[PDB]
Design an enzyme around this catalytic site. Structure first.
Site, PDB file in Angstrom:
ATOM      1  N   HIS A  54      17.667  -0.708  -6.650  1.00  0.00           N
ATOM      2  CA  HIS A  54      18.702  -1.603  -6.108  1.00  0.00           C
ATOM      3  C   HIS A  54      18.096  -2.598  -5.104  1.00  0.00           C
ATOM      4  CE1 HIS A  54      22.556  -2.979  -4.836  1.00  0.00           C
ATOM      5  NE2 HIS A  54      22.542  -2.387  -3.654  1.00  0.00           N
ATOM      6  N   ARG A  89      11.809   4.028   4.752  1.00  0.00           N
ATOM      7  CA  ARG A  89      12.398   3.685   6.047  1.00  0.00           C
ATOM      8  C   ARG A  89      13.818   4.232   6.282  1.00  0.00           C
ATOM      9  NH1 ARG A  89      12.920  -1.384   3.333  1.00  0.00           N
ATOM     10  NH2 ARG A  89      15.223  -1.598   2.883  1.00  0.00           N
ATOM     11  N   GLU A 138       5.640   4.119   0.130  1.00  0.00           N
ATOM     12  CA  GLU A 138       4.777   2.994  -0.175  1.00  0.00           C
ATOM     13  C   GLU A 138       4.704   2.224   1.131  1.00  0.00           C
ATOM     14  OE1 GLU A 138       8.035  -0.387  -1.005  1.00  0.00           O
ATOM     15  OE2 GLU A 138       6.742   0.064  -2.736  1.00  0.00           O
ATOM     16  N   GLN A 206       2.634   5.026  -9.019  1.00  0.00           N
ATOM     17  CA  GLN A 206       2.465   3.758  -9.689  1.00  0.00           C
ATOM     18  C   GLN A 206       0.997   3.514  -9.969  1.00  0.00           C
ATOM     19  OE1 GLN A 206       4.522   4.050  -6.897  1.00  0.00           O
ATOM     20  NE2 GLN A 206       6.549   3.708  -7.842  1.00  0.00           N
ATOM     21  N   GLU A 252       8.050  -8.629 -15.411  1.00  0.00           N
ATOM     22  CA  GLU A 252       9.209  -9.151 -14.677  1.00  0.00           C
ATOM     23  C   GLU A 252       9.337 -10.656 -14.867  1.00  0.00           C
ATOM     24  OE1 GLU A 252       8.300  -6.934 -10.561  1.00  0.00           O
ATOM     25  OE2 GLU A 252      10.506  -7.093 -10.872  1.00  0.00           O
ATOM     26  N   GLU A 253      10.559 -11.113 -15.162  1.00  0.00           N
ATOM     27  CA  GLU A 253      10.835 -12.545 -15.339  1.00  0.00           C
ATOM     28  C   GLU A 253      10.294 -13.324 -14.140  1.00  0.00           C
ATOM     29  OE1 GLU A 253      13.213 -10.340 -14.758  1.00  0.00           O
ATOM     30  OE2 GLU A 253      14.723 -11.020 -13.292  1.00  0.00           O
ATOM     31  N   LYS A 685     -35.038  -4.321  25.341  1.00  0.00           N
ATOM     32  CA  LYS A 685     -35.005  -3.684  24.018  1.00  0.00           C
ATOM     33  C   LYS A 685     -36.415  -3.415  23.490  1.00  0.00           C
ATOM     34  CE  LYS A 685     -30.711  -6.159  22.782  1.00  0.00           C
ATOM     35  NZ  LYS A 685     -30.009  -6.943  21.712  1.00  0.00           N
ATOM     36  N   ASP A 688     -36.703   0.264  24.359  1.00  0.00           N
ATOM     37  CA  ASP A 688     -35.540   1.097  24.114  1.00  0.00           C
ATOM     38  C   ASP A 688     -35.797   2.229  23.120  1.00  0.00           C
ATOM     39  OD1 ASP A 688     -35.600  -0.100  21.667  1.00  0.00           O
ATOM     40  OD2 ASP A 688     -33.622  -1.087  21.847  1.00  0.00           O
ATOM     41  N   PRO A 814     -40.317  -5.811  18.218  1.00  0.00           N
ATOM     42  CA  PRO A 814     -39.475  -4.598  18.197  1.00  0.00           C
ATOM     43  C   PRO A 814     -39.685  -3.617  19.373  1.00  0.00           C
ATOM     44  CG  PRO A 814     -40.271  -5.103  15.981  1.00  0.00           C
ATOM     45  CD  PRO A 814     -40.899  -6.139  16.904  1.00  0.00           C
TER      46      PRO A 814
HETATM   47 CA   LIG Z   1     -37.155  -1.526  20.534  1.00  0.00          CA
END
Ligand SMILES: [Ca+2]
Length: 888
Positions: A54, A89, A138, A206, A252-253, A685, A688, A814
Site C-alpha cells: 500500500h 517504522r 529495510e 529481496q 514497474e511502469e 619520523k 619513529d 624512512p
Molecule cells: Ca621511520
C-alpha cells in the site's frame, strides 16, 4: 462494513509462491482513474501468499471494503492467504510511525510496547480479518527522529516485534495468523533477526537483478560477494531452510535507473507495439524457482514484487537512459502460475518416507531434527543425534550427503556399523549439486566446495558385534567410546589416516577394542584389521630449536633446515627428520606395521619451501636471505614466517657465528629533535622505529639539503649508524637517493651547550660540530648505508642529508639509526679515558713505571668497552680503577 467469517485453510506446505500487489493498481482504489483495470481478487490459486503493498499517503477506502468483503473470501476459498505489509517504522515512535505517534497511549515501556503490538495487530490484521502481517526490515523504512535514523527507535522496534510475535505467528496466541519478515539486509546487518526469528513463519529476502543473483564483483579479492549462497548462509543461523523465500521483481511502469532489474523477459527492440511477454524461458525468475541452497535444506519458495505487472514485458535495456511496456495491462498472472508449476516439478520436495528410513523411530528423529524433504538429506550439514534406544535399524543413514555430526548413543539393538548404514560423507568428497544461477566465471561452473567428512560419536552401543570403518581416510577415532562397545568381535579401521603410535588417543581407543575382541573371539588378522594408515602431516604449533652456534668458516648454512623443521600428526606425534619417520614406520601392532608401505617420509612431511625469513645482525642490519654465510663473525636474530602471515613470526632463533656479540639497540629511536633547517614534525619520523607508509609524507623539506639537530633519549656508547633511502620504503620511489651525508656530534669543548640549546638555528652550521662520518654514494642502487663508529659518546647530534639534485628533489629518509649499547654516564667514562691518554703524554712529570701502570688500567677499561658481550658492570668497575689511578 460486514466483515465475513474466516474460511479455514490448510497448513502452509511448501514450495510456496508469493506476490506483492500494489494497492493503487486495484481498480476499486481510485474510481477516478481509467487505466486501472486489475484486481487483487483475481490472483490465482497458484499464489500462496498475496501481500497487500500500500501507499500510506492514500486513503482508498473503497478498496479496503472490496478487499475485506470480497477479495479475502474469494482468495481464502481457493487456498490463498492475504497478508498486510507494513514498514519497520510502525514498530516504534518517531517520524511517520502512524499508531506509535501517540506517546501517551503507547509509551516506550513494557506496558506501552505490549499495548502498541496489540494496536498494530488490531489495525493491520484483525480489522479486515486478514491472514498475516509482513514487516519490512529495510533501511528505507528505519525508525527516524527529525529525519535522523534513531538508535532508540531501532532498539524499541525489536521489543515491539517480540510482542507482536506473542500475538501471531508460531509462538503467538493466534497461530492462524502468519507473522512474516521481509528484508534487504544480510543477516549480520539485520538488527531484528536474532530476537525476531523465533517469532516468524517466513523470512523473505529481496534479491532483484544480476547483483542479487550473482552477488557483486569485488576486484581486490577478485571474487563475488553477497552471493545468493552467502545471503542464505547468514540467515541459516536463525531460520530453517523451509522458511526462506527469495524474491524477484516484475517491471514497474515508468521505472527509473536504479529500479531496472530485468528479472523477467524484455520487449523485443523492434517489436515496438508489444508491451507483453509471458514467456518464463531464460528469466532470472525461472532460475530462482529452481535454485536451492547447497547446504541446510531446500527452500520455502519464491515471491515477486509488483505482481500486478505479471506478464508485462520489461523495457529494453537500450532505452534505460514512452515505451509500450510503460502502459497498464490487465494481467492473467500467467508468469506466476508458470513459476509455481516449475516449483511443483522440483522432486527435492518429495517427502522423506519409510523407503528412506524403514525404522519408524529413526525416521521420526530425522523428520524432527533434519526436515521432511528428500532434498534436505542432500544438504543438511548440522547434527543428527540418535539416542532413542528403540532404534533397531540404521538403514537410510547413507542418504545423508553432508551431515556434520552423527551421534549414536545407547542404541543397544544395533549389531553392525559399516558403509551401508553410515552417511555418504564418511569419506572425503566435493559438492555434487550443480548451480542453476548465472555466475561471473565461465559457463556458470563454480569450484565445487569441499564437504567435510561427518564427525562420528558412538557410545553405549553394547550390542555392536562388528565395526567396519575401513577405507574412509578417517582422520581420527575421536568419538569412539570403546569401553562401552562391550560386544565387539570384529573391527576394521584399515585404510584411514590414523596415527596409532603408542601413547596416542587413537591407539588407546584401538587397544581397548582389541582387548574386547581378544577376550570374545580372539584377536587375529581376520577379526582385527588396522593397517594401511596414511596419517596427515601438520605444522607444529611451536618449535624447539631456539639457538644455533657455528664456527667462523667458509660455509653457507640453510637457516630453515637448521632451525625450522618438523611435522606433527593430529595426535601430537612429532617427526623431525627422516630418522624419526623410520622409527615411526617401525611401530608394530601384533607384529605388523600400521603405516601404509607406500606412504614415505616425503608424502608425509609438511613443506617449508614458501616460508620466509628476516635475519637481523648485531648492528640491526636486516636481510631476508634464507642462506647465511658463516665467513663473518656475527650474531643474529632469525624470524621465520608462514606464507599465510608475513608479519607474525612462527619461530625465532639466535644464530651465533664465532663468539657471541650482544645485539645493539637503536639509541636514536624516540630521539628529540631540537633544530636543523628542516621540518621538525617529519624529522621526528626518522626516529619513529618504522619505515612508514608511502601514504605518509616523510619529506624533510623543500631544498635538496636538510639538517636535523637532535638529542638521544638515553646515554649510550655509540658503535654504528645506518640511514635508509626512500627505496627502502617503496622500491619504486621517484625520490632520489642521498648522494652526500654527514653525521656530526656537537663540539662541547669549544662551544657552550647552553648556547646550542638557546638558539639551535644559530648553531645549524658545520663550524660548531665535529664530523664523525661522511657518506658519498657510489652510484648503484642502495636502500641504506651503515658504518661502524668508534665508541662515540654524545648526547647531542647533527645529521645532514643531501640529494645533490635540483628543485623538488627533497631528501626522503624512512629512518636514521644510531646504534650502540646503553651506558649511563658514558660521557664521564669516556672523559676518564681522555684524561688517562693526556697523562700518558707527560713523560717528564711521570716515570715510566707510573705510566706503564696507568696504561694497564686504561687498556683494561678499553678492553671492556669493546668486549663482544657488553657488560656495564665490568666497564663501571674498570672505569673506577682508572679514575682512582688518575689520583694521581
Ligand atoms: Ca621511520
Amino acid at each position: 462494513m460486514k466483515i465475513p467469517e474466516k474460511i479455514p485453510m490448510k497448513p502452509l506446505h511448501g514450495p510456496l509462491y508469493g506476490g506483492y500487489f500494489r494497492t493503487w493498481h486495484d481498480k476499486t482504489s481510485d474510481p477516478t482513474e481509467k487505466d486501472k483495470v486489475n484486481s487483487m481478487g483475481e490472483l490465482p490459486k497458484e499464489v500462496d501468499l498475496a501481500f497487500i503493498f500500500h501507499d500510506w499517503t492514500k486513503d482508498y477506502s473503497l478498496f479496503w471494503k472490496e478487499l475485506a468483503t470480497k477479495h479475502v473470501p474469494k482468495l481464502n476459498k481457493q487456498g490463498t492467504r492475504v497478508i498486510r505489509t507494513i514498514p519497520w517504522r510502525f514498530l516504534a515512535g518517531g517520524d511517520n510511525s502512524g499508531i506509535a505517534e501517540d506517546t501517551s497511549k503507547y509509551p516506550n515501556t513494557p506496558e506501552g510496547n505490549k499495548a502498541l503490538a496489540k494496536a498494530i495487530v488490531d489495525e493491520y490484521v484483525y480489522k479486515y480479518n486478514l491472514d498475516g502481517l509482513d514487516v519490512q526490515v529495510e533501511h528505507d523504512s528505519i525508525p527516524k527522529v527529525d529525519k535522523k535514523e534513531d538508535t532508540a527507535g531501532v532498539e524499541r522496534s525489536i521489543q515491539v516485534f517480540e510482542e507482536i510475535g506473542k500475538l501471531i505467528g508460531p509462538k503467538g496466541v493466534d497461530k492462524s495468523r502468519l507473522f512474516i519478515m521481509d528484508s534487504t539486509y544480510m543477516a549480520d546487518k539485520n538488527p531484528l533477526i536474532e530476537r525476531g526469528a523465533p517469532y516468524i513463519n517466513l523470512l523473505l529476502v529481496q534479491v532483484y537483478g544480476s547483483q542479487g543473483e550473482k552477488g557483486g564483483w569485488e576486484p581486490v579479492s577478485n571474487r563475488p560477494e553477497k552471493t545468493m549462497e552467502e545471503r542464505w548462509q547468514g540467515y541459516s543461523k536463525y531460520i530453517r531452510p523451509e522458511q526462506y523465500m527469495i524474491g524477484f521483481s516484475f517491471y514497474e511502469e515508468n521505472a527509473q535507473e536504479g529500479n531496472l532489474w530485468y528479472d523477467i523477459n524484455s520487449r523485443k527492440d523492434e517489436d515496438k507495439a508489444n508491451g507483453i511477454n509471458t514467456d518464463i524461458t531464460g528469466t532470472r525468475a525461472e532460475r530462482y524457482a529452481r535454485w536451492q541452497p547447497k547446504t541446510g535444506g531446500v527452500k520455502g519458495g519464491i515471491f515477486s514484487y509488483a505482481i500486478d505487472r505479471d506478464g508485462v514485458a520489461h523495457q529494453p535495456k537500450k532505452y534505460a537512459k514512452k515505451d509500450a511496456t510503460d502502459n497498464i495491462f490487465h494481467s492473467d498472472y500467467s508468469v506466476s502460475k508458470a513459476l509455481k508449476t516449475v516449483m511443483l516439478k522440483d522432486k527435492s520436495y518429495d517427502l522423506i518416507d519409510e523407503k528412506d528410513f524403514p525404522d519408524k523411530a529413526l525416521r521420526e528423529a530425522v523428520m524432527a531434527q533434519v526436515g521432511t524433504r528428500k532434498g534436505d538429506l542432500e544438504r543438511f550439514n548440522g547434527t543428527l543425534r540418535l539416542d532413542n534406544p528403540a532404534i533397531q535399524s540404521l538403514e537410510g543413514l547413507n542418504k545423508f550427503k553432508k551431515l556434520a555430526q552423527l551421534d549414536l548413543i545407547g542404541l543397544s539393538r544395533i549389531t553392525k556399523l559399516d558403509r551401508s548404514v553410515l552417511p555418504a560423507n564418511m569419506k572425503p568428497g566435493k559438492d555434487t549439486l550443480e548451480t542453476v544461477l548465472e555466475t561471473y566465471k565461465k559457463d556458470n561452473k563454480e569450484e565445487p566446495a569441499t564437504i567435510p567428512p561427518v564427525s562420528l560419536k558412538v557410545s553405549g552401543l553394547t550390542g555392536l558385534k562388528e565395526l567396519d570403518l575401513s577405507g574412509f581416510d578417517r582422520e581420527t577415532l575421536a568419538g569412539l567410546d570403546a569401553a562401552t562397545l562391550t560386544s565387539l568381535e570384529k573391527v576394521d579401521i584399515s585404510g584411514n589416516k590414523l596415527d596409532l603410535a603408542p601413547g596416542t588417543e587413537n591407539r588407546q581407543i584401538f587397544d581397548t577394542m582389541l582387548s574386547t575382541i581378544s577376550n570374545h573371539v580372539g584377536s587375529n588378522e581376520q577379526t582385527v584389521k588396522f593397517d594401511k594408515q596414511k596419517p596427515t602431516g601438520h605444522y607444529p604449533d611451536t618449535y624447539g630449536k631456539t639457538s644455533l652456534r657455528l664456527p667462523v668458516a667458509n660455509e653457507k648454512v640453510d637457516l630453515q633446515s637448521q632451525l625450522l623443521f618438523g611435522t606433527v600428526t593430529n595426535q601430537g606425534t612429532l617427526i623431525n627428520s627422516e630418522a624419526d619417520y623410520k622409527a615411526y614406520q617401525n611401530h608394530k601392532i601384533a607384529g605388523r606395521s600400521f603405516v601404509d608401505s607406500n606412504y614415505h617420509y616425503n608424502n608425509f612431511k609438511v613443506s617449508y619451501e614458501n616460508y620466509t625469513v628476516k635475519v637481523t645482525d648485531s648492528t640491526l642490519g636486516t636481510t631476508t636471505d634464507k642462506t647465511l654465510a658463516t665467513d663473518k663473525e656475527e650474531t643474529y636474530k632469525v624470524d621465520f614466517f608462514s606464507p599465510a602471515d608475513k608479519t607474525k613470526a612462527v619461530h625465532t632463533a639466535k644464530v651465533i657465528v664465532g663468539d657471541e656479540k650482544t645485539m645493539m639497540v637503536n639509541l636514536a629511536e624516540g630521539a628529540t629533535v631540537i633544530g636543523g633547517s628542516a621540518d621538525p614534525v617529519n624529522a621526528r619520523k626518522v626516529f619513529d622505529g618504522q619505515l612508514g607508509s608511502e601514504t605518509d609524507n616523510i619529506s624533510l623539506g623543500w631544498d635538496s639539503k636538510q639538517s636535523i639537530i637532535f638529542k638521544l633519549k638515553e646515554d649510550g656508547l655509540i658503535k654504528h649508524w645506518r640511514f635508509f633511502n626512500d627505496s627502502a620504503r617503496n622500491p619504486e620511489t621517484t625520490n632520489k637517493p642521498i648522494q652526500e651525508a654527514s653525521l656530526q656530534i656537537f663540539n662541547i669543548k669549544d662551544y657552550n651547550l647552553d648556547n646550542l640549546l638557546e638558539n639551535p638555528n644559530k648553531f645549524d652550521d658545520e663550524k660548531y660540530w665535529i664530523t664523525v662520518d661522511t657518506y658519498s654514494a657510489q652510484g648503484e642502487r642502495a636502500t641504506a648505508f651503515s658504518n661502524t663508529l668508534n665508541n662515540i659518546t654524545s648526547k647531542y647530534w647533527r645529521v645532514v642529508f643531501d640529494t645533490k639534485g635540483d628543485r623538488y628533489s627533497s631528501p626522503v629518509v624512512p629512518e636514521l639509526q644510531i646504534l650502540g649499547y646503553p651506558l649511563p654516564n658514558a660521557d664521564t667514562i669516556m672523559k676518564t679515558v681522555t684524561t688517562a691518554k693526556e697523562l700518558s703524554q707527560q713523560k717528564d712529570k711521570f716515570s715510566q713505571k707510573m705510566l706503564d701502570e696507568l696504561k694497564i688500567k686504561e687498556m683494561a677499561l678499553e678492553t671492556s668497552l669493546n668486549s663482544k658481550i657488553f657488560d656495564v658492570t665490568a666497564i663501571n668497575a674498570n672505569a673506577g680503577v682508572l679514575k682512582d689511578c688518575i689520583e694521581k
